[PDB]
From a paper:
CYTOKININ RESPONSE1 (CRE1), the main cytokinin receptor, has a modular architecture composed of a cytokinin-binding CHASE (Cyclases/Histidine kinases Associated Sensory Extracellular) domain, followed by a transmembrane fragment, an intracellular histidine kinase (HK) domain, and a receiver domain (REC). Perception of cytokinin signaling involves (i) a hormone molecule binding to the CHASE domain, (ii) CRE1 autophosphorylation at a conserved His residue in the HK domain, followed by a phosphorelay to (iii) a conserved Asp residue in the REC domain, (iv) a histidine-containing phosphotransfer protein (HPt), and (v) a response regulator (RR). This work focuses on the crystal structures of the REC domain of CRE1 from the model plant Arabidopsis thaliana and from the model legume Medicago truncatula.
The crystal structure of MtCRE1-REC was solved and refined using X-ray diffraction data extending to 2.5 Å resolution. MtCRE1-REC, residues Ser856-Phe994, crystallized in space group P3121 with one protein subunit in the asymmetric unit, forming a crystallographic dimer with its twofold-symmetric copy. Overall, the refined model includes 126 residues, three water molecules, and one calcium cation coordinated by the protein. There is one missing fragment of 13 residues (936–948) in the electron density map. For MtCRE1-REC, the coding sequence of the full intracellular domain (MtCRE1-IC) was cloned and expressed, followed by limited proteolysis with thermolysin. The intracellular domain was digested, leaving only the REC domain that was used for crystallization. In MtCRE1-REC, the α4 helix and its following elements (Ala958–Phe994) jut toward the complementary protein molecule in the dimer, where the β5 strand joins the four-stranded parallel β sheet of the second subunit. In the MtCRE1-REC structure, the coordination sphere of the calcium ion comprises five oxygen atoms, three Oδ atoms from Asp868, Asp912, Asp959, one backbone O from Gln914, and one water molecule. On the other hand, the Ca2+ ion in the MtCRE1-REC-Ca structure has a larger radius, and with strong electrostatic attraction, it pulls the Oδ atom of Asp959 (helix α4) into the coordination sphere.
Numbering used by the authors:
A (entry chain A), B (entry chain A): 856 to 935, 949 to 994
The structure:
């Protein structure tokens, strides 16, 4: 609703990850452009680009989302508007999750300070 | 509701973290016992203990939640019931979050595959 009409840029090296995020934002009325790479996100973020936000995966080979953001910010300064850039951390989350299960934990608590989530994590009682 | 009446054990080295989680579970009717340490979680998890679940912080000095879980599982096998053990990953999440902000990202997307969360992360439009 509120992000209806806006143009997001979704950067991830993983096609399934792109597909999920872009379908979610497509649902909310955003129109979405993807990019498989930091190098390509910078190509698409040039001097006059018209993007309203950007969902940037932090774990990519060759150039990770942290560098491609340092670059986007320096791109913007040498061109002087703040492109809001939000990190997609599912790569890190999945890795700690395997690390949990692997020492015999029965799962993890997403959003670890939100009540409804601590409930949702405990259905070893039904 | 569903976890009303059950006895959780909340293991964390951080008093504020303990206070939050235990107050959330206290709200839901659980009665809660804490522990500041892996060593103390194992003391409280002995041969006949009566706990129904356990929220285990993965980052503690001296003995981290991963080891104290390997120990709890070996404690249980040498005593042979599966104590459901859920990991609290806020230590890792906070660290990647600083790592995001520090290269000039405007935030991160919690629960990176849930739609309502990708919306909630974008209020650079209001
Ligand atoms: Ca990735
Ligand atoms: Ca901790």
């Amino acid at each position: 609703s509120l992000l209806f009409g806006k143009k997001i840029l979704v950067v991830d090296d993983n096609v399934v990850n792109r597909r999920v995020a872009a379908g979610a934002l497509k649902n909310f009325g955003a129109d979405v452009k993807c990019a498989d790479s930091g190098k390509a996100a910078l190509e698409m973020l040039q001097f006059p680009h018209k993007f309203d936000a950007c969902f940037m995966d932090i774990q990519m080979p060759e150039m990770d989302g942290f560098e491609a953001t340092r670059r986007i910010r320096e791109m913007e300064r040498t061109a002087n508007f703040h492109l809001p850039i939000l990190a997609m951390t599912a790569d890190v989350i999945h890795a700690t999750y395997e690390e949990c299960l692997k020492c015999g934990m029965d799962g993890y608590v997403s959003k670890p300070f939100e009540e409804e989530n601590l409930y949702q994590a405990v259905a070893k009682f039904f």
